Amino acid sequence: LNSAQVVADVLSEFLEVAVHLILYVREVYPVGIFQKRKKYNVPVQMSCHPELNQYIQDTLHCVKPLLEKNDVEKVVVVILDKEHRPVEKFVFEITQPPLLSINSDSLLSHVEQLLRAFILKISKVDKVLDHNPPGCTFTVLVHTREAATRNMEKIQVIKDFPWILADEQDVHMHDPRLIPLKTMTSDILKMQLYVEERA
């Protein structure tokens, strides 16, 4: 589909903005590399560190194809402690329609409004979430059907950025305290965002 390209693009920049902001609000990186920026008419924090920015973009460019052929279920930004085990998880459940309309009009400016709300919620999450333990790092998990990864092969080699199966310990969460943030729905995208904290 051609309208899938645009939903994969739009969704991709959103995820990048979200990731940059989640890294900010959860003190995963030194406050100083983050710069004030503005997307969806809202103030955000984008990083100015070369490699970090390239790491996040290389990650999203690999998801882009999975997003097109509606192969993404959950895109998760996981925060780990020195024990190298999950402390927090920002789950973005995703599902697009079986097919996308060829009557490509500006119902997208409607998506921007919906997206805008996720950004704002993420910006306040540090109010309902205690401070994480020092020295945490992040990773990105992506939930798909083992067969749709075929769409990823070519681009992994392109961006020279390989992926691999996740080990159930690398994902495992204790309990955990589910904290819902936002849930949107629409002609092209139904998305939900919630946080998983540990005890």
Binding site: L52, A166, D170
Partner: peptide, 25 residues
């Protein structure tokens, strides 16, 4: 065919590398 969780082989730059980068103005 069935459910799977995937992630990048490469690890994000360590908070330590970033600090050195920052302190160097």
């Amino acid at each position: 065919d069935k459910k799977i969780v995937i992630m990048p082989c490469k690890c994000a730059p360590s908070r330590q590398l970033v600090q050195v980068w920052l302190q160097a103005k």
